[PDB]
Amino acid sequence: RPPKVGSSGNASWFQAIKAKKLNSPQPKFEGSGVPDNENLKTSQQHGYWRRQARFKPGKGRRKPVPDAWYFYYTGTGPAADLNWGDSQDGIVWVAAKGADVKSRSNQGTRDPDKFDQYPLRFSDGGPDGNFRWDFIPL
Amino acid sequence: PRPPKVGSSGNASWFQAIKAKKLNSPQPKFEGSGVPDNENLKTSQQHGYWRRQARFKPGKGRRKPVPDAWYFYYTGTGPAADLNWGDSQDGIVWVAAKGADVKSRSNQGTRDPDKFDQYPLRFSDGGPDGNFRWDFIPL
């Protein structure tokens, strides 16, 4: 059977945020939780963070390490078929003040062969202290 | 009329390759699943291996070294169909989604290239590390 490949792309435009612990809560944000990105209009500034399980060698038989979460605009990424606000384990919905969550951006997702991940900045206040992320300069 | 056909013939992987960026890149590492998307399959079935292909090209003198290519096969299919998930073998890296049952033997088979094109890789749950790349294939 050929595979059913339905996603237009699953690489987030942005670096992940990482939990600090194996049993960290889901991300919460001081402000909207939408990454800084001036390319979009206010109405279109909404999307979701999605959990990804991570593991390490050895030691072992692989061992778990803390989750990463990646941001996708609504209608893109692994949960592209969800409507904004639909409940799913591992999905946190975010929207800017002034967002119209029925709108759609044409921002799409990132081709990793052509683009490095973009830096995350949250000028309106980022995720809580259960999460960290590597510095990437502007 | 024709005799039986038991093997993976000269079928291919369902999916496009991942390619090393250098002649000395390490084998691919997968912090998340490393299993391509395929909505035919449930989470329990999402496991298999990446297998190295050596590559060479023509040019100055003749034989030129090209970076390694690695191709994905579901467990129980492909050149290493006889292995069980996790069996050591040089040029084989085992992958599985969180929640996979690496004994579930999927039903996707392999690709006859005269009938089906290579399918795009999409990695919901993580792909290979940054030593690897592949061209984007839309659709």
Coordinates of C-alpha atoms in Angstrom, one line a residue:
Chain A
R1 CA 0.0 0.0 0.0
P2 CA 1.4 3.4 -0.7
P3 CA 1.7 5.6 2.3
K4 CA -0.9 8.3 2.9
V5 CA 1.1 11.4 3.3
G6 CA -1.2 14.3 3.9
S7 CA 0.8 17.1 5.4
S8 CA 2.1 19.9 3.4
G9 CA 5.0 20.1 5.9
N10 CA 5.7 19.4 9.5
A11 CA 8.9 21.4 10.2
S12 CA 8.0 24.3 12.4
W13 CA 9.4 27.7 11.3
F14 CA 10.6 28.2 14.8
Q15 CA 12.9 26.6 17.3
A16 CA 11.2 24.4 20.0
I17 CA 10.6 25.1 23.6
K18 CA 11.8 22.4 25.9
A19 CA 10.3 21.2 29.2
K20 CA 12.8 20.9 32.1
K21 CA 11.4 17.7 33.5
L22 CA 9.9 14.4 32.4
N23 CA 6.6 15.3 34.1
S24 CA 6.4 19.1 33.3
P25 CA 3.0 20.6 32.7
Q26 CA 1.9 21.8 29.3
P27 CA 3.2 25.3 28.4
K28 CA 1.5 28.4 29.7
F29 CA 2.5 31.9 28.5
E30 CA 2.6 35.3 30.1
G31 CA 1.2 36.9 27.0
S32 CA -0.4 35.4 23.9
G33 CA 2.1 32.6 23.3
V34 CA 2.3 33.4 19.6
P35 CA 5.9 33.9 18.5
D36 CA 7.1 37.3 17.2
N37 CA 6.6 37.4 13.4
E38 CA 6.0 40.8 11.7
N39 CA 5.2 39.1 8.3
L40 CA 1.6 38.4 9.3
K41 CA -1.4 40.7 10.0
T42 CA -2.9 40.8 13.5
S43 CA -6.0 38.8 12.4
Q44 CA -3.8 35.9 11.4
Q45 CA -1.7 35.6 14.5
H46 CA -2.9 32.3 16.0
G47 CA -1.8 28.8 16.1
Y48 CA -0.9 25.9 18.4
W49 CA 2.0 24.4 20.2
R50 CA 2.4 20.6 19.8
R51 CA 4.2 18.1 22.1
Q52 CA 6.9 15.8 20.8
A53 CA 8.3 13.0 22.9
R54 CA 12.1 12.9 23.0
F55 CA 14.6 10.1 24.0
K56 CA 18.3 9.5 24.5
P57 CA 20.7 6.6 24.2
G58 CA 22.2 4.6 26.0
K59 CA 22.1 3.0 28.6
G60 CA 19.9 1.2 27.5
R61 CA 17.4 0.6 25.5
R62 CA 16.4 4.3 24.9
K63 CA 15.5 6.5 27.9
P64 CA 13.0 9.4 27.9
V65 CA 14.0 13.0 28.2
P66 CA 11.8 16.0 28.6
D67 CA 9.3 16.9 25.9
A68 CA 9.8 19.5 23.2
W69 CA 6.9 21.7 21.9
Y70 CA 6.8 23.3 18.4
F71 CA 4.6 26.1 17.2
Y72 CA 2.5 25.9 14.0
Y73 CA 0.1 28.4 12.5
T74 CA -3.5 27.2 12.4
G75 CA -4.2 25.0 9.5
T76 CA -0.5 23.9 9.1
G77 CA 1.6 21.2 10.6
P78 CA 0.6 17.8 12.0
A79 CA -2.7 19.1 13.4
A80 CA -3.5 21.2 10.3
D81 CA -7.0 19.7 10.2
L82 CA -8.0 20.9 13.7
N83 CA -10.0 24.1 14.1
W84 CA -8.6 26.6 16.6
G85 CA -9.7 25.6 20.2
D86 CA -10.3 21.9 19.4
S87 CA -9.2 19.8 22.4
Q88 CA -6.4 17.3 21.7
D89 CA -3.9 15.9 24.1
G90 CA -0.5 17.5 23.3
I91 CA -2.0 20.6 21.7
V92 CA -2.0 24.1 23.3
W93 CA -3.9 26.8 21.3
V94 CA -2.6 30.4 21.3
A95 CA -3.9 33.6 19.7
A96 CA -2.9 37.3 19.7
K97 CA -5.2 40.0 21.0
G98 CA -7.1 40.9 17.8
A99 CA -6.7 37.5 16.2
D100 CA -9.6 36.1 14.1
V101 CA -9.1 32.4 14.6
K102 CA -11.2 31.5 11.5
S103 CA -8.7 33.3 9.3
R104 CA -5.8 31.5 7.6
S105 CA -2.3 32.7 7.0
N106 CA -0.3 31.6 4.0
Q107 CA 2.7 31.4 6.2
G108 CA 2.8 27.5 5.8
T109 CA 5.7 25.6 7.3
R110 CA 9.5 25.6 6.9
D111 CA 11.5 23.7 4.3
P112 CA 14.5 22.6 6.4
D113 CA 16.7 22.1 3.4
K114 CA 16.3 25.9 2.6
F115 CA 15.8 27.5 6.0
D116 CA 17.4 27.2 9.5
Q117 CA 14.9 27.4 12.3
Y118 CA 13.9 30.9 13.3
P119 CA 14.6 32.3 16.7
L120 CA 11.7 32.5 19.2
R121 CA 11.0 35.9 20.7
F122 CA 7.9 36.7 22.8
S123 CA 7.8 40.5 23.1
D124 CA 4.5 40.2 24.9
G125 CA 5.8 37.6 27.4
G126 CA 6.9 34.1 26.8
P127 CA 6.4 30.7 28.4
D128 CA 6.6 30.0 32.0
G129 CA 9.6 28.8 34.0
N130 CA 8.8 25.1 33.2
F131 CA 10.4 25.7 29.8
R132 CA 13.6 26.9 28.2
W133 CA 15.0 27.3 24.8
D134 CA 18.4 27.8 23.2
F135 CA 19.6 31.3 22.3
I136 CA 19.6 32.0 18.6
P137 CA 20.7 35.4 17.7
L138 CA 18.6 37.7 15.4
Chain B
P1 CA 2.4 -19.4 -15.7
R2 CA 5.0 -17.2 -14.0
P3 CA 6.7 -18.8 -11.0
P4 CA 6.2 -17.6 -7.5
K5 CA 7.7 -14.3 -6.4
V6 CA 8.7 -14.4 -2.7
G7 CA 11.4 -11.7 -2.4
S8 CA 11.4 -7.8 -2.2
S9 CA 12.4 -8.1 -5.8
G10 CA 14.2 -4.9 -6.8
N11 CA 11.5 -2.9 -5.1
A12 CA 12.5 0.3 -3.3
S13 CA 11.7 2.2 -0.1
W14 CA 8.3 3.9 -0.2
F15 CA 10.0 7.2 0.7
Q16 CA 12.6 9.5 -0.6
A17 CA 16.1 9.2 1.1
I18 CA 17.7 11.3 3.7
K19 CA 21.2 12.3 2.7
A20 CA 24.3 13.0 4.8
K21 CA 25.8 16.4 4.4
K22 CA 29.4 15.2 4.4
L23 CA 31.5 12.2 3.4
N24 CA 32.1 11.6 7.2
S25 CA 28.8 12.4 8.6
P26 CA 27.8 10.1 11.5
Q27 CA 24.8 7.7 11.1
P28 CA 21.5 9.5 11.6
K29 CA 20.3 10.1 15.1
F30 CA 16.6 10.5 15.9
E31 CA 15.7 12.2 19.3
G32 CA 12.0 11.9 18.4
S33 CA 10.4 9.0 16.4
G34 CA 12.4 9.1 13.1
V35 CA 9.4 7.4 11.5
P36 CA 7.9 9.1 8.4
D37 CA 4.2 10.1 8.4
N38 CA 1.8 7.5 6.9
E39 CA -1.9 7.8 7.9
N40 CA -2.5 4.1 6.9
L41 CA -0.8 3.1 10.2
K42 CA -1.8 3.5 13.9
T43 CA 0.8 4.5 16.5
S44 CA 1.5 0.8 17.4
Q45 CA 2.6 0.1 13.9
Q46 CA 5.0 3.1 13.5
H47 CA 8.4 1.5 13.6
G48 CA 11.1 0.4 11.2
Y49 CA 14.7 1.0 10.1
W50 CA 16.8 3.4 8.1
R51 CA 19.4 1.6 6.0
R52 CA 22.5 3.0 4.5
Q53 CA 23.1 3.0 0.7
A54 CA 26.8 3.9 -0.3
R55 CA 26.9 6.3 -3.1
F56 CA 29.4 7.1 -5.9
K57 CA 29.5 9.4 -8.9
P58 CA 31.6 9.9 -12.1
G59 CA 34.2 12.6 -12.6
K60 CA 38.0 13.2 -12.2
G61 CA 39.7 9.8 -12.5
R62 CA 36.4 7.9 -12.3
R63 CA 35.1 6.8 -8.9
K64 CA 34.1 9.8 -6.7
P65 CA 32.8 9.5 -3.1
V66 CA 29.1 11.0 -2.6
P67 CA 27.6 11.3 0.9
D68 CA 25.7 8.4 2.3
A69 CA 22.0 8.1 1.5
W70 CA 19.6 6.3 4.1
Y71 CA 16.3 4.8 3.2
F72 CA 13.4 3.9 5.5
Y73 CA 11.7 0.5 5.6
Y74 CA 9.0 -0.8 7.9
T75 CA 10.2 -3.7 10.1
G76 CA 9.9 -7.0 8.4
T77 CA 10.2 -5.5 4.9
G78 CA 13.1 -4.5 2.7
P79 CA 16.7 -5.7 2.5
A80 CA 16.8 -6.3 6.3
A81 CA 13.2 -7.9 6.4
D82 CA 14.7 -10.8 8.4
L83 CA 15.8 -8.7 11.3
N84 CA 13.8 -8.1 14.4
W85 CA 13.5 -4.5 15.6
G86 CA 16.6 -3.6 17.5
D87 CA 19.0 -6.3 16.0
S88 CA 22.5 -4.8 15.5
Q89 CA 23.7 -4.5 12.0
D90 CA 26.1 -2.1 10.5
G91 CA 24.2 0.6 8.3
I92 CA 20.9 -0.1 10.1
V93 CA 19.3 2.5 12.5
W94 CA 16.1 1.4 14.3
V95 CA 13.3 3.9 14.8
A96 CA 9.9 3.8 16.6
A97 CA 7.3 6.2 17.7
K98 CA 6.6 6.5 21.4
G99 CA 4.0 3.8 21.9
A100 CA 5.0 1.5 19.1
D101 CA 4.7 -2.2 19.5
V102 CA 7.8 -3.3 17.6
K103 CA 6.3 -6.7 17.1
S104 CA 3.3 -5.4 15.2
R105 CA 4.1 -6.3 11.7
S106 CA 2.7 -3.8 9.4
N107 CA 1.2 -4.2 6.1
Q108 CA 2.7 -1.6 3.8
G109 CA 5.2 -3.8 1.8
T110 CA 7.7 -2.1 -0.5
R111 CA 7.5 0.1 -3.6
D112 CA 7.5 -1.1 -7.1
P113 CA 9.3 1.8 -8.8
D114 CA 7.7 1.2 -12.2
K115 CA 4.3 1.9 -10.6
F116 CA 4.8 4.3 -7.8
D117 CA 7.0 7.4 -7.4
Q118 CA 8.9 7.9 -4.1
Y119 CA 6.8 9.5 -1.4
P120 CA 7.7 12.6 0.5
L121 CA 9.1 12.5 4.0
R122 CA 7.1 14.3 6.6
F123 CA 8.2 14.0 10.2
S124 CA 5.4 14.9 12.7
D125 CA 7.3 13.4 15.6
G126 CA 10.9 14.3 14.7
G127 CA 13.3 13.4 12.0
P128 CA 17.0 13.0 11.7
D129 CA 19.5 15.3 13.2
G130 CA 21.1 18.2 11.4
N131 CA 23.8 16.2 9.7
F132 CA 21.0 15.1 7.2
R133 CA 19.0 16.8 4.5
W134 CA 16.7 16.0 1.6
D135 CA 15.0 17.9 -1.1
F136 CA 11.4 19.1 -0.4
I137 CA 8.9 17.2 -2.5
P138 CA 5.5 18.9 -2.5
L139 CA 2.2 17.0 -2.1

